[PDB]
Amino acid sequence: SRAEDYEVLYTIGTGRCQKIRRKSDGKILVWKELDYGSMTEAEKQMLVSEVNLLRELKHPNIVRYYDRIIDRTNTTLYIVMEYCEGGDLASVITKGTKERQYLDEEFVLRVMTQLTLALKECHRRLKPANVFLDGKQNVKLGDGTPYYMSPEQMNRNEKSDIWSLGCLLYELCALMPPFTAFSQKELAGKIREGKFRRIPYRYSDELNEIITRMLNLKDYHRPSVEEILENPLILEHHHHHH
Ligand SMILES: COc1cc(-c2cnc(N)c(-c3ccc(C(=O)O)cc3)c2)cc(OC)c1OC
Ligand SMILES: [Cl-]
Ligand SMILES: [Cl-]
Ligand SMILES: [Cl-]
């Protein structure tokens, strides 16, 4: 449980994230590096409590945080977590834009099912760059214009998460967010009228309908996590598999 127990293989992104290999058994992992050296004791107490709660989240659709390593020599904190070889959803969406190719409805149903179960777990106790893919088609929740801001949270709620999920699934389908604008104020205007284009016609009316419900202006009209999973679109094979 010290940094020397792992070899860095290479940097994923820049704190900073790195793909690492545990020496004892060759297990591929990643860590996130936080420099606390510029933090106060109150800020560091916050950081430790937060990290300790992250350690508790054990769920197949949430990024698993295994360990925390302190290198007081560097004043660097390392959060060691599972490696998701598939990258994040943001890159999937970008790939699709680039290669002019829409994502499979089956893939979208997998994201919808597994992300909804992730939220369900969070509520029991959201953007593409915060959604990760493993090697076996599993989706995991981890960790500028606020494209996904819900109407209500734009004024002063578990139904706000549903809205944000709706925006994410929408953008997975259309390869663009449901409400776009050049300024934030234009954005807010668009979000308030609550109008948007149908996802592309290659997607079934049933898929269109549930994404559209999640994007209702009134939070009480949005489906709950439980109503979402009850939908006939959502089958066993859309769930996680080891
Ligand atoms: C395909 O390469 C990429 C991998 C990742 C990536 C892989 N595993 C991870 N655990 C993470 C990751 C998950 C959560 C957090 C957090 O909670 O702060 C941090 C990292 C990421 C990511 C990529 O792009 C962002 C990759 O593409 C090069
Ligand atoms: Cl296209
Ligand atoms: Cl399809
Ligand atoms: Cl269209």
Residues 137 and 61: beta-carbon distance below 8 Å: no
Looking at the fold, whether 161 and 139 belong to one and the same domain comes out as yes
Per the entry, the structure determination technique was X-ray
Say if residue 190 is in the same domain as residue 202.
yes
* In a shared domain, residues 146 and 183: yes
| Residues spanned by the domain of 141 | 41-63+85-242
Binding residue numbers? 12-17, 32
Q: From the centroid of its chain, how far is CA 139?
A: 9
Residue for token pair 């996590």: 225
| Protein residues near ligand 2, an ion, with CB under 5 A | 100
How many helices and strands, by DSSP H and E, does the chain display? 7, 8
Nearest ligand for residue 99 CA? 2
Report the phi/psi class of residue 175: left, alpha or beta, with left for phi > 0 and alpha for psi in -120 to 50.
Answer: left
Among protein residues, the one with the nearest Cα to ligand 1's atom 4 is: 87
In Å, what is the CA distance from 200 to each residue of 57, 95, 105, 186? 36, 17, 11, 24
CB atoms within 10 A of CB 80: 20
Structural contact between residues 165 and 126, judged by C-beta atoms closer than 8 angstroms: yes
CATH of the domain at 114: 1.10.510.10
Helix, strand, coil % in the chain, rounded to nearest 5: 40, 20, 40
Torsion of CA 72, 74, 77, 80, to 10 degrees: -110
What DSSP element (H or E) covers 115? helix 105-124
Output the CA 90–ligand 3 centroid distance in Å: 19
Alpha-carbon distances of 58 from 27, 141, 162, rounded to whole Å: 19, 12, 22
The DSSP annotation for 132-157 comes to EE-TTS-EEE-----TT--TGGGT--
Looking at 29, 49, 84, which one is the last position of a domain? Answer: 84
In whole angstroms, give the CA distance from residue 241 to residue 63: 15
Kindly state whether residues 14 and 116 are assigned to the same domain: no
Domain identity same for 206 and 226: yes
Find residue 140's DSSP bridge partners.
132
**Closest residue CA from atom 20 of ligand 1:** 17
Query: CA of 163: how far to CAs of 142, 152, 156, 200, 231, in Å?
Result: 18, 10, 15, 19, 17
Q: What is the CATH number of the domain that holds 79?
A: 3.30.200.20
Task: Based on the fold, state whether residues 147 and 226 are members of the same structural domain.
Answer: yes
Name residue 31's beta-bridge partners: 18, 80
Supply the angle between the helices 105-124 and 158-174 in degrees, to the nearest 10: 160
131: phi then psi, degrees, rounded to nearest 5: -125, 125
**Number of compact structural domains in the chain:** 2
| Token code pair at residue 7 | 């070899």
Q: Which residue has the tokens 């489906």?
A: 223
162 and 181, same domain (yes or no): yes
Which amino acid type is present at position 142? G
Looking up tokens 């009209």 gives: 221
Same domain, 89 and 79: no
